[PDB]
Amino acid sequence: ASIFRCRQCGQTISRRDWLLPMGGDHEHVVFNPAGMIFRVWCFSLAQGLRLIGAPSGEFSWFKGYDWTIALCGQCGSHLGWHYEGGSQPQTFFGLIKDRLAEGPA
Ligand SMILES: CC[C@@]1(C)CC(=O)NC1=O
Ligand SMILES: [Zn+2]
């Protein structure tokens, strides 16, 4: 169990080696304004996504970062957000843990 695939279609997305402990922890449990709870795992890098629209700072869970919605590039499933415009690191991915499947490389 070392790579993460899209749970809906199997697209390769990220790797356990790429987990990023933001604020001391790779896991952040957060809510959006519609009250949905997300268990977000932070990754330094991802692939196989499609980033939609232009970045926005509104309601950002991570201070100094602007977000863009990240869909699975294959099936369109909403897998998380790409973060940018911040510092150390400038960018990273916050991916929804229960929307990924973990398994061998
Ligand atoms: C509304 C945008 C999202 C869902 C993404 C974020 O970082 N904060 C949020 O609540
Ligand atoms: Zn997919």
CSV table of N, CA, C and O and ligand atoms in Angstrom, one decimal:
chain,number,residue,atom,x,y,z
A,1,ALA,N,0.8,-1.2,0.0
A,1,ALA,CA,0.0,0.0,0.0
A,1,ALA,C,0.9,1.3,0.0
A,1,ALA,O,1.1,1.9,1.0
A,2,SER,N,1.3,1.7,-1.2
A,2,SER,CA,2.2,2.8,-1.3
A,2,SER,C,1.8,3.8,-2.3
A,2,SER,O,2.3,4.9,-2.3
A,3,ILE,N,0.8,3.6,-3.2
A,3,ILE,CA,0.3,4.6,-4.1
A,3,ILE,C,-1.2,4.8,-3.9
A,3,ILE,O,-1.9,3.9,-3.4
A,4,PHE,N,-1.7,6.0,-4.2
A,4,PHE,CA,-3.1,6.3,-4.1
A,4,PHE,C,-3.7,6.5,-5.5
A,4,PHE,O,-3.1,7.2,-6.3
A,5,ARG,N,-4.8,5.8,-5.7
A,5,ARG,CA,-5.5,5.9,-6.9
A,5,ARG,C,-6.9,6.5,-6.7
A,5,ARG,O,-7.4,6.5,-5.5
A,6,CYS,N,-7.5,7.1,-7.7
A,6,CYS,CA,-8.9,7.5,-7.6
A,6,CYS,C,-9.8,6.3,-7.3
A,6,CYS,O,-9.7,5.3,-8.0
A,7,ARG,N,-10.6,6.4,-6.3
A,7,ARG,CA,-11.4,5.3,-5.8
A,7,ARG,C,-12.5,5.0,-6.9
A,7,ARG,O,-12.9,3.8,-7.0
A,8,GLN,N,-12.9,6.0,-7.6
A,8,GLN,CA,-14.0,5.8,-8.6
A,8,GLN,C,-13.6,5.1,-9.9
A,8,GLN,O,-14.3,4.3,-10.4
A,9,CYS,N,-12.4,5.4,-10.3
A,9,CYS,CA,-11.9,4.8,-11.6
A,9,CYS,C,-10.5,4.2,-11.6
A,9,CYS,O,-10.2,3.5,-12.6
A,10,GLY,N,-9.7,4.4,-10.6
A,10,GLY,CA,-8.4,3.8,-10.6
A,10,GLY,C,-7.2,4.6,-11.2
A,10,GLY,O,-6.1,4.2,-11.2
A,11,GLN,N,-7.5,5.8,-11.6
A,11,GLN,CA,-6.5,6.8,-12.1
A,11,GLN,C,-5.4,6.9,-11.0
A,11,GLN,O,-5.7,7.1,-9.8
A,12,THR,N,-4.1,6.8,-11.3
A,12,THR,CA,-3.0,7.1,-10.4
A,12,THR,C,-2.9,8.6,-10.0
A,12,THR,O,-2.9,9.4,-10.9
A,13,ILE,N,-2.9,8.9,-8.7
A,13,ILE,CA,-3.0,10.2,-8.3
A,13,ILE,C,-1.8,10.7,-7.4
A,13,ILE,O,-1.2,11.8,-7.7
A,14,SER,N,-1.4,9.9,-6.4
A,14,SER,CA,-0.3,10.3,-5.6
A,14,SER,C,0.3,9.1,-4.9
A,14,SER,O,0.0,7.9,-5.3
A,15,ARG,N,1.3,9.3,-4.0
A,15,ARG,CA,2.1,8.3,-3.4
A,15,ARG,C,2.2,8.6,-1.9
A,15,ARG,O,2.3,9.8,-1.6
A,16,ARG,N,2.3,7.6,-1.1
A,16,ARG,CA,2.5,7.8,0.3
A,16,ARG,C,3.8,8.5,0.6
A,16,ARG,O,3.9,9.3,1.5
A,17,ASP,N,4.9,8.3,-0.2
A,17,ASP,CA,6.1,9.0,-0.1
A,17,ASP,C,6.0,10.5,-0.3
A,17,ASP,O,6.9,11.3,0.2
A,18,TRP,N,4.9,11.0,-0.9
A,18,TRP,CA,4.6,12.4,-1.1
A,18,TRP,C,3.8,13.1,-0.1
A,18,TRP,O,3.4,14.3,-0.2
A,19,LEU,N,3.4,12.4,1.0
A,19,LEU,CA,2.6,13.0,2.1
A,19,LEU,C,3.4,14.2,2.7
A,19,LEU,O,4.6,14.1,2.8
A,20,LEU,N,2.7,15.2,3.0
A,20,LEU,CA,3.3,16.5,3.5
A,20,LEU,C,2.7,16.9,4.9
A,20,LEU,O,1.5,17.2,4.9
A,21,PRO,N,3.5,16.8,5.9
A,21,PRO,CA,2.9,17.2,7.2
A,21,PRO,C,2.7,18.8,7.4
A,21,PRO,O,3.5,19.4,8.1
A,22,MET,N,1.7,19.4,6.8
A,22,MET,CA,1.4,20.8,7.0
A,22,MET,C,0.9,21.0,8.4
A,22,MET,O,0.0,20.4,9.0
A,23,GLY,N,1.6,22.0,9.1
A,23,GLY,CA,1.3,22.3,10.5
A,23,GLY,C,1.5,21.2,11.4
A,23,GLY,O,0.9,21.1,12.5
A,24,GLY,N,2.4,20.3,11.1
A,24,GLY,CA,2.7,19.1,11.9
A,24,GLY,C,2.0,17.8,11.6
A,24,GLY,O,2.3,16.8,12.2
A,25,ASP,N,1.0,17.9,10.7
A,25,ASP,CA,0.2,16.7,10.5
A,25,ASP,C,-0.2,16.6,9.0
A,25,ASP,O,-0.7,17.6,8.4
A,26,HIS,N,-0.1,15.4,8.4
A,26,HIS,CA,-0.6,15.3,7.0
A,26,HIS,C,-2.1,15.3,7.0
A,26,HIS,O,-2.7,15.6,5.9
A,27,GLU,N,-2.8,14.9,8.1
A,27,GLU,CA,-4.2,14.8,8.1
A,27,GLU,C,-4.8,16.1,8.8
A,27,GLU,O,-4.4,16.5,9.9
A,28,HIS,N,-5.8,16.7,8.1
A,28,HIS,CA,-6.6,17.8,8.6
A,28,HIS,C,-8.1,17.5,8.3
A,28,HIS,O,-8.5,17.3,7.2
A,29,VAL,N,-8.8,17.5,9.4
A,29,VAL,CA,-10.3,17.3,9.3
A,29,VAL,C,-10.9,18.7,9.3
A,29,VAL,O,-10.8,19.5,10.3
A,30,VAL,N,-11.6,19.0,8.3
A,30,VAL,CA,-12.1,20.3,8.0
A,30,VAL,C,-13.6,20.3,7.5
A,30,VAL,O,-14.1,19.3,7.0
A,31,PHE,N,-14.2,21.4,7.6
A,31,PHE,CA,-15.6,21.6,7.1
A,31,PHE,C,-15.6,22.7,6.1
A,31,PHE,O,-15.0,23.8,6.2
A,32,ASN,N,-16.5,22.6,5.1
A,32,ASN,CA,-16.8,23.6,4.1
A,32,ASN,C,-18.0,24.4,4.5
A,32,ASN,O,-18.7,24.1,5.5
A,33,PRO,N,-18.4,25.5,3.8
A,33,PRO,CA,-19.5,26.3,4.2
A,33,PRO,C,-20.9,25.6,4.1
A,33,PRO,O,-21.9,26.0,4.7
A,34,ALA,N,-20.9,24.5,3.3
A,34,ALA,CA,-22.1,23.7,3.3
A,34,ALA,C,-22.2,22.6,4.4
A,34,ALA,O,-23.1,21.8,4.4
A,35,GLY,N,-21.2,22.7,5.3
A,35,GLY,CA,-21.2,21.8,6.4
A,35,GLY,C,-20.7,20.4,6.2
A,35,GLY,O,-20.8,19.5,7.0
A,36,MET,N,-20.1,20.1,5.0
A,36,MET,CA,-19.5,18.8,4.7
A,36,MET,C,-18.2,18.7,5.4
A,36,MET,O,-17.4,19.7,5.3
A,37,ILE,N,-17.9,17.6,6.0
A,37,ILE,CA,-16.7,17.3,6.7
A,37,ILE,C,-15.8,16.6,5.8
A,37,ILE,O,-16.3,15.7,5.0
A,38,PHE,N,-14.5,16.9,5.7
A,38,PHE,CA,-13.6,16.3,4.8
A,38,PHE,C,-12.4,15.9,5.6
A,38,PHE,O,-11.9,16.7,6.4
A,39,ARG,N,-11.9,14.7,5.5
A,39,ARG,CA,-10.6,14.3,6.0
A,39,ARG,C,-9.6,14.5,4.9
A,39,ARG,O,-9.6,13.7,3.9
A,40,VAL,N,-8.8,15.6,5.0
A,40,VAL,CA,-8.0,16.0,3.9
A,40,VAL,C,-6.6,15.5,4.3
A,40,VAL,O,-6.1,15.7,5.4
A,41,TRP,N,-5.9,14.8,3.4
A,41,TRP,CA,-4.5,14.4,3.5
A,41,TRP,C,-3.7,15.3,2.6
A,41,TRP,O,-4.1,15.5,1.4
A,42,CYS,N,-2.7,15.9,3.1
A,42,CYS,CA,-1.8,16.9,2.3
A,42,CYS,C,-0.7,16.1,1.6
A,42,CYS,O,0.0,15.3,2.2
A,43,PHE,N,-0.5,16.4,0.3
A,43,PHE,CA,0.6,15.9,-0.5
A,43,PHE,C,1.4,17.0,-1.1
A,43,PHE,O,0.8,18.0,-1.5
A,44,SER,N,2.7,16.8,-1.2
A,44,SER,CA,3.5,17.8,-1.8
A,44,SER,C,3.3,17.8,-3.3
A,44,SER,O,3.5,18.8,-4.0
A,45,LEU,N,2.9,16.6,-3.9
A,45,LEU,CA,2.8,16.4,-5.3
A,45,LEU,C,1.6,15.4,-5.6
A,45,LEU,O,1.3,14.6,-4.8
A,46,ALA,N,1.1,15.6,-6.8
A,46,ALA,CA,0.0,14.7,-7.3
A,46,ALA,C,0.1,14.8,-8.8
A,46,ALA,O,0.7,15.7,-9.4
A,47,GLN,N,-0.6,13.8,-9.4
A,47,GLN,CA,-0.7,13.7,-10.8
A,47,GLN,C,-2.1,13.2,-11.2
A,47,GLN,O,-2.8,12.7,-10.3
A,48,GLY,N,-2.4,13.2,-12.5
A,48,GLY,CA,-3.7,12.6,-13.0
A,48,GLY,C,-4.9,13.4,-12.6
A,48,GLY,O,-6.0,12.9,-12.8
A,49,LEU,N,-4.7,14.6,-12.1
A,49,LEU,CA,-5.9,15.5,-11.7
A,49,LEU,C,-6.1,16.5,-12.8
A,49,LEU,O,-5.3,16.6,-13.8
A,50,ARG,N,-7.2,17.2,-12.7
A,50,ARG,CA,-7.5,18.3,-13.6
A,50,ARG,C,-8.0,19.5,-12.7
A,50,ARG,O,-8.9,19.3,-11.9
A,51,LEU,N,-7.2,20.6,-12.7
A,51,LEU,CA,-7.5,21.7,-11.8
A,51,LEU,C,-8.5,22.7,-12.5
A,51,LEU,O,-8.2,23.1,-13.6
A,52,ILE,N,-9.5,23.0,-11.8
A,52,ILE,CA,-10.6,23.8,-12.5
A,52,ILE,C,-10.6,25.2,-11.9
A,52,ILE,O,-10.5,25.5,-10.7
A,53,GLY,N,-10.8,26.2,-12.9
A,53,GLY,CA,-11.0,27.6,-12.5
A,53,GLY,C,-9.7,28.2,-12.1
A,53,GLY,O,-8.6,27.7,-12.2
A,54,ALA,N,-9.8,29.4,-11.6
A,54,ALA,CA,-8.7,30.2,-11.1
A,54,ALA,C,-8.7,30.2,-9.6
A,54,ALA,O,-9.7,30.0,-9.0
A,55,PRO,N,-7.5,30.3,-9.0
A,55,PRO,CA,-7.4,30.3,-7.6
A,55,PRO,C,-8.3,31.3,-6.8
A,55,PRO,O,-8.5,32.4,-7.3
A,56,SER,N,-8.7,30.9,-5.6
A,56,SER,CA,-9.5,31.7,-4.7
A,56,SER,C,-9.0,31.5,-3.3
A,56,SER,O,-8.7,30.4,-2.9
A,57,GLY,N,-8.9,32.7,-2.6
A,57,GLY,CA,-8.5,32.6,-1.2
A,57,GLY,C,-9.8,32.5,-0.2
A,57,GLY,O,-9.6,32.2,0.9
A,58,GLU,N,-11.0,32.6,-0.8
A,58,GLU,CA,-12.2,32.5,0.0
A,58,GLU,C,-12.4,31.2,0.8
A,58,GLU,O,-12.3,30.1,0.2
A,59,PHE,N,-12.5,31.3,2.1
A,59,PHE,CA,-12.7,30.2,3.0
A,59,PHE,C,-11.5,29.2,3.1
A,59,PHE,O,-11.7,28.1,3.6
A,60,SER,N,-10.3,29.6,2.7
A,60,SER,CA,-9.2,28.7,2.6
A,60,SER,C,-8.9,28.1,4.0
A,60,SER,O,-8.8,28.9,5.0
A,61,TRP,N,-8.8,26.8,4.1
A,61,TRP,CA,-8.4,26.1,5.3
A,61,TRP,C,-7.0,26.3,5.7
A,61,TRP,O,-6.6,26.0,6.8
A,62,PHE,N,-6.2,26.8,4.8
A,62,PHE,CA,-4.7,26.9,5.0
A,62,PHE,C,-4.3,28.3,4.8
A,62,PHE,O,-4.4,28.8,3.6
A,63,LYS,N,-3.9,29.0,5.8
A,63,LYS,CA,-3.6,30.4,5.8
A,63,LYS,C,-2.5,30.7,4.8
A,63,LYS,O,-1.5,30.1,4.7
A,64,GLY,N,-2.8,31.8,4.0
A,64,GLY,CA,-1.9,32.2,3.0
A,64,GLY,C,-2.0,31.5,1.6
A,64,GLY,O,-1.3,31.9,0.7
A,65,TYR,N,-2.8,30.5,1.6
A,65,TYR,CA,-3.0,29.7,0.4
A,65,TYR,C,-4.4,30.0,-0.3
A,65,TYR,O,-5.4,30.1,0.4
A,66,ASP,N,-4.3,30.0,-1.6
A,66,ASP,CA,-5.5,30.1,-2.4
A,66,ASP,C,-5.7,28.7,-3.1
A,66,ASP,O,-4.8,28.0,-3.3
A,67,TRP,N,-7.0,28.3,-3.3
A,67,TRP,CA,-7.3,27.0,-3.7
A,67,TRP,C,-7.9,27.0,-5.1
A,67,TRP,O,-8.6,28.0,-5.5
A,68,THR,N,-7.7,25.9,-5.8
A,68,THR,CA,-8.5,25.5,-7.0
A,68,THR,C,-9.0,24.1,-6.8
A,68,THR,O,-8.3,23.3,-6.2
A,69,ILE,N,-10.2,23.8,-7.3
A,69,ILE,CA,-10.8,22.5,-7.2
A,69,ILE,C,-10.0,21.5,-8.1
A,69,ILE,O,-9.6,21.9,-9.2
A,70,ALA,N,-9.7,20.4,-7.5
A,70,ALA,CA,-9.0,19.3,-8.2
A,70,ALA,C,-9.9,18.1,-8.5
A,70,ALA,O,-10.4,17.5,-7.5
A,71,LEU,N,-10.2,17.9,-9.7
A,71,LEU,CA,-10.9,16.7,-10.1
A,71,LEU,C,-10.0,15.6,-10.6
A,71,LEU,O,-8.9,15.9,-11.1
A,72,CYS,N,-10.4,14.4,-10.5
A,72,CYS,CA,-9.8,13.3,-11.2
A,72,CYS,C,-9.8,13.6,-12.7
A,72,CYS,O,-10.9,13.9,-13.2
A,73,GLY,N,-8.6,13.6,-13.3
A,73,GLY,CA,-8.5,13.9,-14.7
A,73,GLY,C,-9.2,12.9,-15.6
A,73,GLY,O,-9.5,13.2,-16.8
A,74,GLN,N,-9.3,11.7,-15.1
A,74,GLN,CA,-9.9,10.6,-15.9
A,74,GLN,C,-11.5,10.6,-15.8
A,74,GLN,O,-12.2,10.7,-16.8
A,75,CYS,N,-12.0,10.6,-14.6
A,75,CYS,CA,-13.4,10.4,-14.4
A,75,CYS,C,-14.2,11.6,-13.9
A,75,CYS,O,-15.4,11.6,-13.9
A,76,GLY,N,-13.5,12.7,-13.5
A,76,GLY,CA,-14.1,13.9,-13.0
A,76,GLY,C,-14.5,13.9,-11.6
A,76,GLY,O,-15.1,14.9,-11.1
A,77,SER,N,-14.2,12.8,-10.8
A,77,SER,CA,-14.6,12.8,-9.4
A,77,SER,C,-13.8,13.9,-8.7
A,77,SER,O,-12.7,14.2,-9.0
A,78,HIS,N,-14.5,14.5,-7.7
A,78,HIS,CA,-13.9,15.6,-7.0
A,78,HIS,C,-13.0,15.0,-5.9
A,78,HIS,O,-13.4,14.4,-4.9
A,79,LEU,N,-11.7,15.2,-6.1
A,79,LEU,CA,-10.7,14.5,-5.3
A,79,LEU,C,-10.1,15.4,-4.2
A,79,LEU,O,-9.5,14.9,-3.2
A,80,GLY,N,-10.1,16.7,-4.4
A,80,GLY,CA,-9.6,17.6,-3.4
A,80,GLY,C,-9.4,19.0,-4.0
A,80,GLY,O,-10.2,19.5,-4.8
A,81,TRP,N,-8.3,19.6,-3.6
A,81,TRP,CA,-7.9,21.0,-4.0
A,81,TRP,C,-6.4,21.1,-4.2
A,81,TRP,O,-5.7,20.4,-3.5
A,82,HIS,N,-6.0,21.9,-5.1
A,82,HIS,CA,-4.6,22.4,-5.2
A,82,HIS,C,-4.5,23.7,-4.5
A,82,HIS,O,-5.4,24.6,-4.6
A,83,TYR,N,-3.4,23.9,-3.7
A,83,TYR,CA,-3.2,25.1,-3.0
A,83,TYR,C,-1.9,25.8,-3.5
A,83,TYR,O,-0.9,25.1,-3.9
A,84,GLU,N,-2.0,27.1,-3.6
A,84,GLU,CA,-0.9,27.9,-4.2
A,84,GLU,C,-0.9,29.3,-3.6
A,84,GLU,O,-1.7,29.6,-2.8
A,85,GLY,N,0.1,30.1,-4.0
A,85,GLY,CA,0.2,31.5,-3.5
A,85,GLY,C,0.7,31.6,-2.1
A,85,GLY,O,0.8,32.8,-1.6
A,86,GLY,N,1.1,30.5,-1.4
A,86,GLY,CA,1.6,30.6,-0.1
A,86,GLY,C,3.1,30.6,0.0
A,86,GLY,O,3.8,30.9,-0.9
A,87,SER,N,3.6,30.1,1.2
A,87,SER,CA,5.0,30.0,1.5
A,87,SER,C,5.4,28.7,2.2
A,87,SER,O,4.8,28.3,3.1
A,88,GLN,N,6.5,28.1,1.8
A,88,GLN,CA,7.1,27.0,2.4
A,88,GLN,C,6.1,25.9,2.8
A,88,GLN,O,5.9,25.6,4.0
A,89,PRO,N,5.5,25.2,1.8
A,89,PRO,CA,5.8,25.3,0.4
A,89,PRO,C,4.9,26.3,-0.3
A,89,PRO,O,3.8,26.7,0.2
A,90,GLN,N,5.3,26.8,-1.5
A,90,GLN,CA,4.4,27.7,-2.3
A,90,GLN,C,3.1,27.0,-2.7
A,90,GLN,O,2.1,27.7,-2.7
A,91,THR,N,3.2,25.7,-3.0
A,91,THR,CA,2.0,24.9,-3.4
A,91,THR,C,2.0,23.6,-2.8
A,91,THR,O,3.1,23.0,-2.4
A,92,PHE,N,0.8,23.0,-2.7
A,92,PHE,CA,0.6,21.5,-2.3
A,92,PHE,C,-0.8,21.1,-2.7
A,92,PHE,O,-1.7,21.9,-3.1
A,93,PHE,N,-1.1,19.8,-2.4
A,93,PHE,CA,-2.5,19.3,-2.7
A,93,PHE,C,-3.1,18.8,-1.4
A,93,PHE,O,-2.5,18.2,-0.6
A,94,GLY,N,-4.4,19.2,-1.2
A,94,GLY,CA,-5.2,18.6,-0.1
A,94,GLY,C,-6.2,17.7,-0.8
A,94,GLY,O,-7.2,18.2,-1.4
A,95,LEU,N,-6.0,16.4,-0.5
A,95,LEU,CA,-6.9,15.4,-1.2
A,95,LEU,C,-7.7,14.7,-0.2
A,95,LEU,O,-7.4,14.5,1.0
A,96,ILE,N,-8.9,14.4,-0.6
A,96,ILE,CA,-9.9,13.8,0.3
A,96,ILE,C,-9.7,12.3,0.4
A,96,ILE,O,-9.8,11.5,-0.5
A,97,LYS,N,-9.3,11.9,1.6
A,97,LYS,CA,-8.8,10.5,1.9
A,97,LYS,C,-9.7,9.4,1.5
A,97,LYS,O,-9.3,8.4,0.9
A,98,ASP,N,-11.0,9.5,1.8
A,98,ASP,CA,-12.0,8.5,1.5
A,98,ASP,C,-12.4,8.5,0.0
A,98,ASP,O,-13.1,7.6,-0.4
A,99,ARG,N,-11.8,9.4,-0.8
A,99,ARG,CA,-12.0,9.3,-2.3
A,99,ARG,C,-10.8,8.7,-3.0
A,99,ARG,O,-10.8,8.7,-4.3
A,100,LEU,N,-9.8,8.2,-2.3
A,100,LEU,CA,-8.7,7.6,-2.8
A,100,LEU,C,-8.7,6.1,-2.4
A,100,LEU,O,-9.3,5.8,-1.4
A,101,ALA,N,-8.0,5.3,-3.2
A,101,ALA,CA,-7.8,3.9,-2.8
A,101,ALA,C,-6.3,3.7,-2.7
A,101,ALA,O,-5.6,4.1,-3.7
A,102,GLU,N,-5.8,3.1,-1.6
A,102,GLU,CA,-4.4,2.9,-1.4
A,102,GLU,C,-4.0,1.4,-1.8
A,102,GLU,O,-4.7,0.5,-1.4
A,103,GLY,N,-2.8,1.3,-2.4
A,103,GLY,CA,-2.4,-0.1,-2.8
A,103,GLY,C,-1.0,-0.1,-3.3
A,103,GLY,O,-0.3,0.9,-3.4
A,104,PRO,N,-0.6,-1.3,-3.8
A,104,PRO,CA,0.8,-1.4,-4.3
A,104,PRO,C,1.2,-0.7,-5.5
A,104,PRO,O,0.3,-0.4,-6.4
A,105,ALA,N,2.5,-0.3,-5.7
A,105,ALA,CA,2.9,0.6,-6.8
A,105,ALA,C,3.0,-0.2,-8.1
A,105,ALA,O,3.1,-1.4,-8.1
B,1,LIG,C1,-15.1,26.7,-0.2
B,1,LIG,C2,-13.7,26.2,-0.5
B,1,LIG,C3,-13.2,25.0,0.4
B,1,LIG,C4,-14.1,23.8,0.1
B,1,LIG,C5,-11.7,24.7,0.1
B,1,LIG,C6,-11.1,25.3,1.4
B,1,LIG,O1,-9.8,25.3,1.6
B,1,LIG,N1,-11.9,25.7,2.2
B,1,LIG,C7,-13.2,25.4,1.8
B,1,LIG,O2,-14.2,25.4,2.5
B,2,ZN,ZN,-11.3,8.9,-11.2
